[PDB]
Ligand binder design. Structure first.
Ligand SMILES: *C(N)[C@@H]1CCCN1C(=O)[C@@H]1CC[C@H](COc2ccc(C(=O)O)cc2C(C)(C)C)N1
Lengths: 726, 726
């Protein structure tokens, strides 16, 4: 009877998930965007009022892609002429609209091609980066004060991250941090002078006669890394007749002895800032807590307030050392660190005490600290039901660590096992966001008694829609391997009949600290495969996976391309013996790290898989960036880990591809996993006489996300899967 | 019964064609190489003697890939450390071995990375190019005289051609011409200073961490072209204390007025040299005949000895103006030029007479002038049987143009209809080389009475081998289109049964002045398709084809991508109505220009073809080099031919690919047809939502000729054809 979730439904997004993206502007109100206008809501009662009409900018002349209201409510930042760069970076044009006089500020406007803009935390001050230099605007209509003068494209970055810092550490283009009340503006400076450049052709539109060459400072494993410097400027000291003086915060000496990185910056108070550094060998990290010296104007980082965080089993943090959450006075803070038992939990520190006290414990982990009041600490964890793939909001009484309360567990057990949260300014209210296993559910609550105020969005519309279609179900469970249990998931075709034998597709990523087996509800390609082609799509989290402790996560330390791929093969081997799996039709595919694993698997010689697809795969670790690779592989030198760097390439397994059908895909403008990686794979396959299918995507990057390329790759991959199974 | 010509037989070359490559060292003897040693033969009797034993260089230390014996027989040039560059260019190392003293010359040796070396025509002088500069060596063991000092990589080329001159005009790296007795050394100089650079990535071996960027001066259609200068130096005036003086030969004034090219250089006598120039608009060409002035030391080119050659229907020459063949005294010459009727024939000129006299005529063409004696002129033509695809050696009495004799026609009518020839120094003897329709046959003759002396090679070995295999046959014939008849050929499966219906593959090239329909015997991929897969492989020569007069060849003037592709579609349409052709299984494929035509055809919307394969295709003429493109397309400017340049792209036809199965293939290091061309095609296909198969070959160039890549592409293409037909 009736329809199924088709490929076209996925590519054309016929069944959409409704969201409820709000933005707290205070401890009592939040702004709520809409395709037309922006409304302001009162958390307590729910009543609203238009903040600015959808018509205020009808004849602005440009297509605005984003707004940013100053903390004052007095101004609105208008963003247009958006030009995407990397995963987070982009340039655009900006105009400021005065809400008090309802006029568009025309004087001393923010230059075009601005790399980054941000209001101060409280008033309406502005800090932005242009041509790699920092500028501060005390008043929207007043001239800008140039803070830095050393900016130089591809060389010196002031206030913005270079390629690797953007992608691997801060996950942001921004490299500036305003102090709590906006008095100080802290920023980092990156020097890429000796960083090697990755070069690749960009064809551009047909009209371009000669292909251009794109080059970007990109440090590959073991190469020269960018250096970093940190500064803090007092925005209340700007003149216009004198150049602003930036106080530098150097060291630590234990870091200066060699290559290192700035990995975190968090203000503690109006005059206290914490900085976290990491050695190139991401084994050891140091936290500095620097206080402003009223009489010297300098920033002192008292050794005594330095906290060392290191690891003997691997690297520090999931992807980097976690951030600290200070108490109002800044004399103490909480932060997630690995247990003595290897599990990440919240540890309570005294800025001057060397040993911290854990306040949570157990065979589970704290995903993140969400909010801190003088009374309670709110955090997300996968403790409930001992399910590593579930997430719940908990709160712990700071005066009695024995009193912990789960705020999300029982709201709707059936429908919700995965939550994210958004607290208001003073944590007076919070919005819970349930993303599965059922349809996304957004609700509002008040912290005084954790009372449920109301449902903001329940996706009732989509719900009525999906009951007219034969949707697939999701099975979350585990299998045991050497005493240890590992979770997996399966998107089961509708009317799943354990009697019948289904072809199985193994959806894999499996990079360090990853999780592909969870309770999240998704509408993707896998949905179509199960619903329309009656294909079972499975995912498994083996050695290397995260949120299950360092014993599992650090198992692939200095040894990438080993256990995580073995466990993948093993999981599929067990699946093929389940009764409803046609072991003669088992495939595997992945993207980026998932492309690497997929290739390593297909070239393992296990014969377990018939065909596989690798999209933008890593082929050899010496080709990927230093910050990521080295974190798990160390340095590619003979004295260090060169041997394993060379033992874990995809091309060395070239010969074994004779037994499988392989589809290799890659964007030619991939700035992240360079086309080079797939170029070497295809060449190793040719040199060995192995036939395979290939597809390049001209000018597409790592996401192969343009509207047309996206539909084309999934369409192309569907034909390949259908053919390999039918 | 028994085997067939398999794909593996083609890729592994199990059935080899024997050759007989000889080299005339005089009018009576020729050298004959062998995998081991070199022998010297006496043409008159056939007796031989070893010239140099296969052991003379056992402990040389290097792998010699080629030898060159000086005209004296006194020295041997040894070539090793061969590093290929473009289609003709390459660098290598050289050593000279003295045959008189049987020693290896160790003093003043030729530098490594030498770009070009050549003995003088008579003695043992040497001229070579290193680091783009010319050097002359009067004696093998004496210091070299540097002739030029302006050489500069990618900028100034002395004695060697730049990229476009190598590929499009001289079909050689060499740009130096010794005078008949070695007294003068003429050379060209190319300046690429403002020539744009094509840039592309070269991945190299896996060990390379960062992909390198190759850039080469390459003028695309309409771009800035390289400039050229011509010089002549007297090698008998070299000192060692003074810099050699090179006399320049400039003009013509009718050429200097704008962009032009040097397209031919031919010495007439010891002191007379002829030069041919061509305007950027390859409509008009001028020939200069310059005499050495004994008392001025200069070279005078007397306007009166200038011969203009232009065309009103198209460009000049088949690919460039033909070369002249002077009479012993140099006061007259013969050269192939287009008729009043449009057919190319030999015209007799008086260096001082404005009008030449044709000595051959008819609805056929002279392919080339092979030899000239004071008595006879020997030439190759396709006159015999009125077959444009056949070739025969003829000789015409210079005293009675009415007396022409075919020297090859009746030697073996059945087996031989395609001949090439090689005369000795004074044309006392000639070697005929039959390449089809039967197995290659090499024979020797004496010019006195054109008597057949003996068979040098008859491929008797391969003959016995091929009778144990089910080989295909070749049908050469024609079809009529608008009064005019056009020839085609078909490789018919063994035991061809006109009753049965066979799938047909259209092998196409069809660039201007091409011929894919001939009587040549070939052992290639097409042989396998017909023998093993029972596929008919056809080729058709329509408008644009050569050797049939300018009315057919110039039909696509300034209009590439029109009639040559239309006729291709039309030829296939007629084939599909022949009775033994399954019109439901007709494919088309080609390489380079053939890739362009194949794409244009598949995107025509004719629906005649089910699938097609394009290898390294041109996609839009603005992306190809100027010298070639402009010769047929003019300049891509609005005032000229920009409109047709834009109407003849493959991407504009993108939408029509929905009806066909397309396989796109290209080498990423193609320096000739840049990967860019296929990158734009694939992108235009993605933007329109058309699915297709693709395959890139990392680091392979236009030939995709490495041992592994070659076998891989044909293997990959075979799977595609088999699937499209079965
Ligand atoms: C493919 N997946 C390639 C090949 C292995 C490493 N690859 C990466 O892309 C790595 C993995 C981690 C990092 C990307 O990190 C992020 C991207 C996006 C966000 C986000 O919040 O949107 C966050 C991250 C972090 C927090 C750094 C994991 N580069």
């Amino acid at each position: 009877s009736r329809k199924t979730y088709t490929l076209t439904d996925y590519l054309k997004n016929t069944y959409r998930l409704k969201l409820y993206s709000l933005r707290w502007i205070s401890d009592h109100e939040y702004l709520y965007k809409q395709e037309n206008n922006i409304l302001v809501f009162n958390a307590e009662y729910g009543n609203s009022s238009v903040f600015l009409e959808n018509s205020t900018f009808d004849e602005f002349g440009h297509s605005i892609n984003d707004y940013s209201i100053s903390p004052d409510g007095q101004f609105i930042l208008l963003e247009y002429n958006y030009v995407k760069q990397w995963r987070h970076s982009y340039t655009a044009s900006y105009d400021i609209y005065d809400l008090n006089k309802r006029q568009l500020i025309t004087e001393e406007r923010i230059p075009n091609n601005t790399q980054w803009v941000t209001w101060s935390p409280v008033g309406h001050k502005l800090a932005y980066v242009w041509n790699n230099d920092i500028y501060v605007k005390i008043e929207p209509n007043l001239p800008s004060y140039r803070i830095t003068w050393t900016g130089k494209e591809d060389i010196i970055y002031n206030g913005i991250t270079d390629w690797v810092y953007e992608e691997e550490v801060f996950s942001a283009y921004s490299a500036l941090w305003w102090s709590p009340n906006g008095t100080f503006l802290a920023y980092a400076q990156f020097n890429d002078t000796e960083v090697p450049l990755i070069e690749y052709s960009f064809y551009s539109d047909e009209s371009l006669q000669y292909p251009k060459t794109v080059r970007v400072p990109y440090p590959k494993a073991g190469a020269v890394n960018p250096t970093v410097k940190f500064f803090v400027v007092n925005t209340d000291s700007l003149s216009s007749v004198t150049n602003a003086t930036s106080i530098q915060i150097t060291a630590p000496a234990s870091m200066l002895i060699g290559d290192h990185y700035l990995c975190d910056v968090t203000w503690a108070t109006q005059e206290r800032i914490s900085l976290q550094w990491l050695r190139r060998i991401q084994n050891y990290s140091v936290m500095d807590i620097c206080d402003y010296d009223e009489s010297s104007g300098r920033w002192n980082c008292l050794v005594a307030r330095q906290h060392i965080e290191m690891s003997t089993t691997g690297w520090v943090g999931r992807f980097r050392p976690s951030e600290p959450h200070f108490t109002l006075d800044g004399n103490s803070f909480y932060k997630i660190i690995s247990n003595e038992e290897g599990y990440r939990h919240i540890c309570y520190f005294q800025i001057d005490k060397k040993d911290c006290t854990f306040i949570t414990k157990g065979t589970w982990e704290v995903i993140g600290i969400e909010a801190l009041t003088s009374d309670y600490l709110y955090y997300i964890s996968n403790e409930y039901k001992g399910m590593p793939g579930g997430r719940n909001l908990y709160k712990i009484q700071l005066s009695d660590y024995t009193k912990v309360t789960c705020l999300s567990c029982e709201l709707n057990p059936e429908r919700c096992q995965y939550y994210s949260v958004s607290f208001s300014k003073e944590a007076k209210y919070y919005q819970l966001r349930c993303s599965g296993p059922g349809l996304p559910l957004y609700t509002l609550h008040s912290s005084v008694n954790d009372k449920g105020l109301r449902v903001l969005e329940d996706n009732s519309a989509l719900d009525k829609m999906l009951q007219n279609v034969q949707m697939p179900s999701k099975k979350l469970d585990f299998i045991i391997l050497n005493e240890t249990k590992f979770w997996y998931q399966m998107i089961l075709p509708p009317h799943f009949d354990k009697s019948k034998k289904y072809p199985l597709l193994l959806d894999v990523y499996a990079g360090p600290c990853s999780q592909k087996a969870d309770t999240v509800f998704r509408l993707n390609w896998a949905t179509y495969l199960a619903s329309t082609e009656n294909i079972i799509v499975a995912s498994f989290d083996g050695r290397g996976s995260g949120y299950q402790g360092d014993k599992i996560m650090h198992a692939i330390n200095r040894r990438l391309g080993t256990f995580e791929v073995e466990d993948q093969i093993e999981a599929a081997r067990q699946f093929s013996k389940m009764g409803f799996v046609d072991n003669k039709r088992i495939a595997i595919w992945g993207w980026s790290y998932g492309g690497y694993v997929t290739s390593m698997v297909l070239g393992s010689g296990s014969g377990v898989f018939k065909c596989g697809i690798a999209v933008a795969p890593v082929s050899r670790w010496e080709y990927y960036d230093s910050v990521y690779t080295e974190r798990y592989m160390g340095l590619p030198t003979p004295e260090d880990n060169l041997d394993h760097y060379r033992n874990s390439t995809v091309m060395s397994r070239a010969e074994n591809f004779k037994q499988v059908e392989y589809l290799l895909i890659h964007g030619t403008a991939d700035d992240n996993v360079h086309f080079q990686q797939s170029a070497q794979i295809s060449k190793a396959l040719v040199d060995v006489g192995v036939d395979f299918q290939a597809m390049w995507y001209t000018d597409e990057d790592h996401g192969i996300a343009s509207s047309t390329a996206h539909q084309h790759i999934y369409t192309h991959m569907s034909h390949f899967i259908k053919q390999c199974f039918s």
